[PDB]
From a paper:
The linear ubiquitin chain assembly complex (LUBAC) participates in inflammatory and oncogenic signaling by conjugating linear ubiquitin chains to target proteins. LUBAC consists of the catalytic HOIP subunit and two accessory subunits, HOIL-1L and SHARPIN. In addition, linear ubiquitin chains linked via the N-terminal Met1 are generated by the linear ubiquitin chain assembly complex (LUBAC), which consists of the catalytic HOIP and the accessory HOIL-1L and SHARPIN subunits. Both SHARPIN and HOIL-1L interact with HOIP via their ubiquitin-like (UBL) domains, and the two interactions are thought to sufficiently stabilize LUBAC. We solved the co-crystal structure of the binding regions of the trimeric LUBAC complex and found that LUBAC-tethering motifs (LTMs) located N terminally to the UBL domains of HOIL-1L and SHARPIN heterodimerize and fold into a single globular domain.
Numbering used by the authors:
A (entry chain B): 473 to 629
B (entry chain C): 169 to 300
C (entry chain A): 2 to 136
Write the structure that this text describes.
């Protein structure tokens, strides 16, 4: 009975997901758009409106915890989309994702003072790529020694 | 960590708010990743037979019904556990599954029940992506 | 669903607060749930599958006695040859001069990291870097 309506409602949304994918929009983009705006034309909304919303997510993130440096669009987007277009949750998670990553980089040697905030911003919140960049200076002298006179002999194991 | 977790649910099941606050705050400072689930018993009972209609980018939609697959699964199950079962039986990793139940695209973290699944025959849509 | 719905929302919000370091929100949701005497399964999420990113604590020594500890991001199902390439791409040490050891045991290009005991964050390995003059 209500089963009929659930099937209809589902199909109605699958339809827009379907249109979206063939135009390059993920299903969480289409649905996030639908939830936020109520638009009948989600593709159009994404092209024209999304960047203003992501811009807002990043500034509000910076306002809510100004200790955490500056938020990137890739981080705003990821939060917006994991919370399906709920603005206040998206802001919460954008902040939380970055807080969590600064806490990890700190425990791995790299706090705010050694450039974690700048490297997280620089790489769209990608912890793996920030860690790489932050340890470059540590490996440079190993790179620079490779051809020095008189190395120790090749160990056997 | 794992004892603080135990102590957390003991404190909440206990009615003891202050003990819940002291332990929830400590786990928070440490960024502990938790699964916090309700009791299975609180949910509408199962297993239920879910009627799944699979779809993709080019499939021709129609109000023709015909679920391709029936799955026996409990309403208390997370959407993430439906994705694991479907990866087992059929080979499609979570990365390409998108679940639609009713008006909603589903979050992995949420139960089937929370999207209204509770009876045999209930309809859900599995949308499979073609470029992960 | 009764307001079993509501109790789930709050539970899930507590998990997000805790993981996101939001101390005051963790307090709020824990407080609301404790006050409703809600029985919950609370568990630490298991350490990841072998197809998921973990942090490897690599001890590095070179052919000139120099040592340093660095942290790589690996998946345990990845091969030593894939590891070698990662370290080549990132920092320029050619695969040819990377000698990986875990145990007292020189790992081989075909062997997975998983194969060698590496499975969680914090696990260890030793990278020996050969000179270009080593014969």
């Amino acid at each position: 009975g209500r089963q009929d309506k659930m099937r209809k409602e589902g199909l109605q949304l699958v339809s827009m997901i379907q249109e979206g994918e063939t135009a390059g929009a993920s299903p969480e983009e289409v649905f996030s758009a639908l939830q936020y705006s109520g638009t009948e034309v989600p593709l159009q909304w994404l092209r024209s409106e999304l960047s203003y919303v992501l811009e807002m997510v990043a500034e509000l993130a910076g306002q809510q915890d100004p200790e955490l440096g500056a938020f990137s669009c890739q981080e705003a987007r990821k939060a917006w989309l994991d919370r399906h277009g709920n603005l206040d949750e998206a802001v919460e998670e954008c902040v939380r994702a970055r807080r969590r990553k600064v806490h990890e980089l700190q425990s791995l040697g790299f706090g705010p003072k050694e450039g974690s905030l700048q490297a997280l911003f620089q790489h769209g919140g990608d912890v793996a790529r920030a860690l790489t960049e932050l340890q470059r200076q540590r490996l440079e002298p190993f790179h620079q020694r490779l051809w020095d006179r008189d190395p120790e002999p090749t160990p056997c194991w | 960590k794992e004892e603080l977790a135990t102590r957390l649910s003991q404190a909440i099941a206990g009615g003891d708010e202050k003990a819940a606050a002291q332990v929830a705050a400590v786990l928070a400072q440490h960024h502990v990743a938790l699964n916090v689930q309700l009791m299975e018993a609180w949910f509408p009972p199962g297993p239920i037979r879910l009627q799944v209609t699979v779809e993709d980018a080019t499939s021709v939609l129609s109000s023709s019904s015909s679920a391709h697959v029936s799955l026996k699964i409990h309403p208390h199950c997370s959407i993430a556990a439906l994705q694991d079962q479907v990866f087992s039986e059929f080979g499609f990793p979570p990365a390409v599954q998108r679940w639609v139940i009713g008006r909603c695209l589903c979050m992995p973290e949420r139960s089937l029940a929370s999207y209204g699944v509770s009876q045999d025959g209930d309809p859900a849509f599995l949308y499979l992506l073609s470029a992960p | 669903d009764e307001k079993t719905k509501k109790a789930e929302e709050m539970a899930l919000s507590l998990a997000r607060a805790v993981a996101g370091g939001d101390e005051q929100a963790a307090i709020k949701y824990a407080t609301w749930l404790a006050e409703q005497r809600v029985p919950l399964r609370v568990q630490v999420k298991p350490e990841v599958s072998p197809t998921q990113d973990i942090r490897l604590c690599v001890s590095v020594e070179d052919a000139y006695m120099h040592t340093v500890t660095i942290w790589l991001t690996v998946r345990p199902d990845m091969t030593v040859a894939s590891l070698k390439d990662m370290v080549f791409l990132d920092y320029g040490f050619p695969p040819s001069l990377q000698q990986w050891v875990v145990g007292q045991r020189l790992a081989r290009d075909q062997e997975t990291l998983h194969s060698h005991g590496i499975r969680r964050n914090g696990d260890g390995a030793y990278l020996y870097l050969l000179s270009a003059r080593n014969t």
